[PDB]
Design a protein around this ligand. Structure first.
Ligand SMILES: OC[C@H]1O[C@@H](O[C@H]2[C@H](O)[C@@H](O)[C@H](O)O[C@@H]2CO)[C@H](O)[C@@H](O)[C@@H]1O
Length: 218
């Protein structure tokens, strides 16, 4: 039961972090519970109540994968499944994959030269960094594609037009899209991080239950 800002637990190839990186922007608390974490997947939940700092993310409690880092151009597949639900959707928050890449394979793993997000859900109109630049079709499904930047990190967010509580896909289809359509430098960027979780702004109490998350990088 993980309540502290960087409380964490690792089982198998999964690492679950409470990751209350934004806690000083508001008032409240958040605890993350690990149900299972094995070679094959992980199940966990996080319960939070946040107020204040309404335009600032308070946290990104998440499960992250331990994998062999490699150039995005050398990746064949990133198969993943995510099944989740929120008990309370009267909130301002999003549910998302978060991936970082860097030119340095030893970059710090909480940021990148690039970031790729895949938002399975958003509540209350909260939005990714930047602006919508395209509607992208990936594996036969449409995504709003956002692009933003903070002057070091450049972030592409693929946003689901409606909530996807049971997702199965290959994240490498998204990297391929970026490489082929947006000049993403796949041959000089290492994939360094692959996480799935939720980013709350305000609301609660609310509980994200992740009944299963799996991924691999081949
Ligand atoms: O700002 C540092 C903080 O970033 C977190 O990642 C952010 C990302 O920077 C942002 O572009 C995106 O919209 O949301 C993610 C998730 O909140 C990261 O999780 C932290 O560990 C890091 O301290």
């Amino acid at each position: 039961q993980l309540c502290d800002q960087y409380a964490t637990y690792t089982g198998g190839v999964y690492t679950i972090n409470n990751n209350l990186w934004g806690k000083d922007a508001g008032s409240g608390s958040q605890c993350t519970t690990v149900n299972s974490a094995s070679s094959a997947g992980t199940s966990w939940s996080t319960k939070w109540n946040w107020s204040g700092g309404e335009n600032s993310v308070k946290s990104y409690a998440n499960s992250g994968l331990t994998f062999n880092k490699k150039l995005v151009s050398q990746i064949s597949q990133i198969p993943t499944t995510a099944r989740w639900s929120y008990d309370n959707t009267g909130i301002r928050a999003d549910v998302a994959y978060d991936l970082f890449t860097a030119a340095d394979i030893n970059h710090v793993t909480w940021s990148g030269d690039y970031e790729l997000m895949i938002w399975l859900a958003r509540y209350g109109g909260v939005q990714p960094i930047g602006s919508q630049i395209a509607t992208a079709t990936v594996d036969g499904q449409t995504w709003e594609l956002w692009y933003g930047a903070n002057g070091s990190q450049k972030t592409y967010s693929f946003v689901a037009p409606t909530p996807i509580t049971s997702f199965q896909g290959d994240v490498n289809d998204f990297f391929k899209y970026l490489t082929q359509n947006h000049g993403f430098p796949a041959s000089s960027q290492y994939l360094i991080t692959l996480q799935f979780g939720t980013a709350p702004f305000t609301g609660g109490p609310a509980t994200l239950s992740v009944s299963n998350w799996s991924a691999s990088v081949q």
